[PDB]
Structure formats: structure tokens, C-alpha cells
Design a protein around this ligand. Structure first.
Ligand SMILES: O=N[O-]
Ligand SMILES: O=N[O-]
Ligand SMILES: [Cu+2]
Ligand code: NI
Length: 306
């Protein structure tokens, strides 16, 4: 429901509070409309996002995304997300998908927000799929925040292409992404893939001593939630992280490159990890392809579509 007089901030005890991030009674007019709003953190000192509860109108909402950043794109009450999520780096934290219910964060794992370094804003993205009561929508996510230092820190290792070109009518275009991991060990517990209409399959592995350990494999045309990892996977100083997207050009009249519009593409694998608080960092990114010849021994599963 829509909040009203009671406010978005709910105390749970002396150190915990829930924060409801809701669309400010919005009303769409077209199909596939993307709405976005932001919420400054109520505390200025450091806190840990320890849990998420979805509050979605199961009739209208296709998916939701929650980000953490410091410069939301619009100082507005809400905006068309085409304008942008964040001017700075948008950190993904939560992803709700309609027909793919999210898995909870492991216990003891939490994101670092606020303080000197952590995110100062939450930004919410709500995709509306199908559209007549003239109702004002307040769908969103309720977020459990604590000030208690969590022993394990959640983080994101984003893997993304940039230089990809998909020629028109080209049967198979591969986008390889590879990086050497150079931090304290991390443990991947969930993953999410992102592609636009041209992607067929996305796969992420850990290569250690020349052997591929599957992190995640998915059709990007399937709902784009965070799916849990079958068996938790440690990546460690030395290991190489490797991802491939498979694209088709068939159907397109002109060549497609990486971009933000629906006629552009994207090969994004979001690896969600946790680290020991004392070693932890919160976000890593790989946009390089440091070991391209290594992809010669990529598992055949990464090329056959699920
Ligand atoms: O992450 N070694 O069990
Ligand atoms: O997923 N649209 O860039
Ligand atoms: Cu995209
Ligand atoms: Ni382990």
C-alpha cells in the first residue's frame, strides 16, 4: 500500500530500521515504462543493508532493481530511467523478478552503505509491463538496515563488454571478458545476467591452473534476477575470471554495438560475492580481455544455448 502519514522509516530496535523505498504514487501511460526515484540514507554514519522485502503489485510489475550511488541522475521526485540511474557508478544490490523469486542474503552478509565511503543514496527502478483504475502506484522495496558491523561484507564484481560489435545477420558473435583476480579471496553466492534481445547465452567461470569452474549460466531472455550459485565458489589472488556472451545478428538490419538504448547491446554478468569484513571491498569491475587465447579451452556448454 501507499505509506502516508507514518513515514518511510521504521525502527526495529535501537540499532535497526526498515526503510521503504516506494514510487511516489505514480501512474504510467504507456507499456514498458521505466520509473526511477531516489532516497538519501537517513543515517549519515556507516550502516549495513542486511535484508530486502519486495512490495510489488503482482498485476503490474515485471521487475525491480535497487542501486546504491552518490549522484542520482535526477533531483526529481521520479523520472524515466532512460534519463539514467546514477551519474556516478550505480551499484546493484537487489533484483526482483516476477516469475523468479529472489533468494535471501546469507546470514551475516551485508552491504556497506553510508559512512565516509559507502553509498549515500538508494535508487529504485520499476519496470511496468502491462496496462485503468487511474490508481497511483507505490510499489517498491523495503530494506533492513543495521548499524551493527557485519562479519561478512556483500560486494559486486561486474563483468562487462565494451568493444563488442555484432554485424547484421551474423550467426554467432562472442563477447569474451577476462581478468586476473588480485584481491583477498571472495565467495560468489549469486549471479545475474544482462543482455538485450540479441543475447542467447551468458556464462561466467573461475579459471584456476587452467581449469574452468562454472559460476553461472543463463539465458538473458529468461527473467534477469539474481540466481543463487549451485555450489559456493571462491575466487582468489591468481585466479582468472572469464565470461562469454553469445549474440546473434539475425533479425537485425544494421550492426549492433554496446550501448544503453534497446537497439544497442550489453554483455553484463553481475557476480555477487561476500568477503571477510577486514579484507572486504565492495565493487570490482572487469572490462578487459586479458587472456583471450585462454578462451580456446572454454567448456562447450558456454556456446550451446540453454
Ligand atoms: O574458499 N575455500 O573453501
Ligand atoms: O537494458 N537497457 O540498456
Ligand atoms: Cu541494458
Ligand atoms: Ni570456500
Amino acid at each position: 500500500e501507499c505509506l502516508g502519514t507514518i513515514g518511510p522509516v521504521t525502527p526495529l530496535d535501537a540499532s535497526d530500521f526498515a526503510l521503504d523505498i516506494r514510487m511516489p504514487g505514480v501512474t504510467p501511460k504507456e507499456s514498458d515504462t521505466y520509473f526511477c526515484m531516489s532516497m538519501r540514507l537517513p543515517v549519515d554514519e556507516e550502516a549495513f543493508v542486511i535484508d530486502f522485502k519486495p512490495r510489488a503489485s503482482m498485476d503490474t510489475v515485471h521487475h525491480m532493481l535497487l542501486f546504491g550511488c552518490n549522484m542520482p541522475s535526477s533531483t526529481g521526485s521520479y523520472w524515466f530511467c532512460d534519463e539514467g540511474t546514477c551519474t556516478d557508478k550505480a551499484n546493484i544490490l537487489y533484483a526482483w523478478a516476477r516469475n523468479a523469486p529472489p533468494t535471501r542474503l546469507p546470514k551475516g552478509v551485508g552491504f556497506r552503505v553510508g559512512g565516509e565511503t559507502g553509498s549515500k543514496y538508494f535508487v529504485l527502478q520499476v519496470h511496468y509491463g502491462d496496462i485503468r483504475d487511474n490508481h497511483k502506484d507505490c510499489s517498491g522495496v523495503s530494506v533492513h538496515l543495521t548499524r551493527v558491523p557485519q562479519p561478512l561484507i556483500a560486494g559486486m564484481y561486474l563483468m562487462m563488454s565494451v568493444d563488442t560489435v555484432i554485424p547484421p545477420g551474423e550467426k554467432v558473435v562472442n563477447a569474451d571478458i577476462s581478468c586476473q583476480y588480485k584481491m583477498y579471496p571472495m565467495h560468489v553466492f549469486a549471479y545475474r545476467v544482462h543482455t538485450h534481445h540479441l543475447g542467447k547465452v551468458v556464462s561466467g567461470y573461475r579459471v584456476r591452473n587452467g581449469q574452468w569452474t562454472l559460476i553461472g549460466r543463463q539465458n538473458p531472455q529468461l527473467p534477469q534476477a539474481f540466481y543463487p550459485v549451485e555450489h559456493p565458489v571462491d575466487v582468489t589472488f591468481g585466479d582468472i575470471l572469464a565470461a562469454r556472451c553469445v549474440f546473434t545478428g539475425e533479425g537485425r538490419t544494421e550492426a549492433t554495438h554496446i550501448g544503453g538504448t534497446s537497439s544497442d547491446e550489453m554483455c553484463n554478468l553481475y557476480i555477487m560475492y561476500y568477503m571477510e569484513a577486514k579484507y572486504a571491498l565492495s565493487f570490482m569491475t572487469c572490462t578487459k580481455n586479458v587472456a583471450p587465447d585462454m578462451f580456446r579451452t572454454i567448456p562447450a556448454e558456454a556456446n550451446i544455448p540453454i
